[PDB]
Design a protein around this ligand. Sequence first.
Ligand SMILES: CCN(CC)C(=O)N(C)c1ccc(C(=O)Nc2nnnn2C)c(C(F)(F)F)n1
Ligand SMILES: CCN(CC)C(=O)N(C)c1ccc(C(=O)Nc2nnnn2C)c(C(F)(F)F)n1
Ligand SMILES: [Co+2]
Ligand SMILES: [Co+2]
Lengths: 379, 379
Amino acid sequence: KNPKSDKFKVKRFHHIEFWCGDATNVARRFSWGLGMRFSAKSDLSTGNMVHASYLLTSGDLRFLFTAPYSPSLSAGEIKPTTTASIPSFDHGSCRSFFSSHGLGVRAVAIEVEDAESAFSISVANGAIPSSPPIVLNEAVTIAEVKLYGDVVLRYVSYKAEFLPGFERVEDASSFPLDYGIRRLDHAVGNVPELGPALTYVAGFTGFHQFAEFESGLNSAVLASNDEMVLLPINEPVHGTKRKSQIQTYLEHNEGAGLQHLALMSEDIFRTLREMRKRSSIGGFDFMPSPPPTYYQNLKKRVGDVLSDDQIKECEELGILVDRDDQGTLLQIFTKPLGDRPTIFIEIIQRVGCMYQSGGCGGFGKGNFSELFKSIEEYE
Amino acid sequence: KNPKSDKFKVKRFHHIEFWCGDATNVARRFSWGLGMRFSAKSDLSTGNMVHASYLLTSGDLRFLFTAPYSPSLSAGEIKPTTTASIPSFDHGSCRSFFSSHGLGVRAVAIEVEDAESAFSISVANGAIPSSPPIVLNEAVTIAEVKLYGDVVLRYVSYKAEFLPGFERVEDASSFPLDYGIRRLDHAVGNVPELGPALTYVAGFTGFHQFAEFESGLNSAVLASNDEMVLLPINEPVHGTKRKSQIQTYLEHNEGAGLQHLALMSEDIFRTLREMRKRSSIGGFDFMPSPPPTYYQNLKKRVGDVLSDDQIKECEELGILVDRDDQGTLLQIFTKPLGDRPTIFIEIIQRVGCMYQSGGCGGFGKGNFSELFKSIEEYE
Ligand SMILES: CCN(CC)C(=O)N(C)c1ccc(C(=O)Nc2nnnn2C)c(C(F)(F)F)n1
Ligand SMILES: CCN(CC)C(=O)N(C)c1ccc(C(=O)Nc2nnnn2C)c(C(F)(F)F)n1
Ligand SMILES: [Co+2]
Ligand SMILES: [Co+2]
């Protein structure tokens, strides 16, 4: 049941902003590991004496990597006279964020019809303001409200090139990498208690609950009107045998924050082939493959959507497949993106629901015991 | 004139330690950009609840990348009960270092006959203690004294595998990259005033001055007895036409620190070919090539050591060559390794002085006007 209760008009994920200590090194690692291209920059070469920001993009996906310079470079400026292209940026907030959380996402940014109305309506419905609406170059307005822990939801709208103040990087410094990933599918937070986290976020957005046809966690998914913007949220279930990786997240992250970004690819087999080739030469590593008892048991679960030639292809790459009432889902997980066992990336491709409807296949909830039973069948 | 006045027995560069905010992402970028292999680790998988440290090595060169975890993971430990494998590590120092300087070198580590005597003799001759000698697993002793700004000189000695507490990483996670770089040649600091910086460092080491057969800077080089350990130091010359890149360093770095690491390669042409191939896919970029007026004018300067077939090879890669009284030197510079225009890397190969004697060829001092005259000859 989709009541379409969005309190304002939201279009689609716009970008994800990472707060790091060195933007260049993280951005270069991500660029090579994920086959994202170097798109735009704001830094000292563009007159930005405040922060260094680098945008990677592939398909519609935009990853923004930001880090602070020395405050001494901008000591004489004031907020109206600033050179920062992200007006919400602040040195102490950024330093306090990275020192507290390690590498992680600061903002999940959705495009809206009008950011200032989206900001006004939001706080009027309970959102905690983070940065009030600011109009950039009479062309883009930007506003931020708190989402959970230290991550904010960032509203973006254009009257009418990424953002004012950003230059387009040299064509020779830009190399057209592409491993098939195309857009952000969903972004998932971990919180100490989901109920208040849901009430608050559903409270100011009007997002509705998505259908979700020892766990380790309890989860629930928030969705815009066309179910394109999807914001799941997990919580721990204290008392299981094996300590919950959600609670593990909370202790190493110092509280709530973004757990994983799920990136959809137009060809998951080719994406995984190219990311796997780079695992040990600077890219990303993946979580251990499941035992073949799993892939042996899958013909009896998805043999209608997939030829056993390509289910074999799934066992090579360690891909995971599940199915909901309407579609089936292929998914695999990277190991944590940095030092701490916190934020990781999911690669997904969804088939069905045709002009594809959001959420087609669910989020792999059935895999918890599809893997557990599989582990048991081996031993 | 080499008086051999070293106040204690120093063998050779041991390692370089980088303090970052995320050790993994910097280490992966460096590994791919420089063709260094993943060698050893100390982190949560090795029981280290304090810091994450990753060693890359190629030839005799060892790059150590360290970042702090949340202090909450180790809140109950005390210095005798610590799990840190680098006993000198401290959370506040590390966080204050990276927030102040950006990515940069914290320690230049030289191997000695006996670290505690080297530490004792050093401070007795003026060194400012940083971390007193500590014996690791009755097998390695470690001590640190201040060198300039916030970088320390780290003494290492073995009675008799990198350091106690470090495990050797899995062979499948280790990929045998190698672009020909083999050992560290010299490491160069920038300071506000060189005289006091030299007096102090020459004061506690006994290192002697190396021969150095609008500048932009004034420099001087410190050398151990066999002139293997080389510690140059630059200072600005205020008042030139173009602002001194040394002073530029000091303002963006927030004071003194390490300016460049010079890595020697067994085949600079192949090193540069392989690093250049990766410039735009995650590696390192190089400073703009010189105009061919330079390479046209070089036959009349080094045509005896190099065939014009390989001087052509030098013009492709933008390599730079100079010569001293005994040897000739090939060198090229990377752009800064991170966000700030601070620390960069030099690649070098030295021919001559044969069983090769340190410093063979100098440090490219003649290139300042070999490039200036060349720039003028074009225009
Ligand atoms: C190998 C270990 N491993 C992942 C670490 C698993 O075993 N399993 C069973 C899964 C399966 C799906 C998802 C997921 O993606 N859920 C989701 N995505 N959006 N909303 N939700 C709720 C997650 C995750 F990522 F949340 F933890 N774990
Ligand atoms: C392209 C711009 N550019 C480098 C940025 C230059 O134009 N020139 C002329 C040089 C030449 C050599 C060295 C060097 O390596 N000197 C050294 N090494 N050890 N001791 N010393 C004193 C340096 C450096 F790296 F110090 F700045 N600059
Ligand atoms: Co997911
Ligand atoms: Co040099």
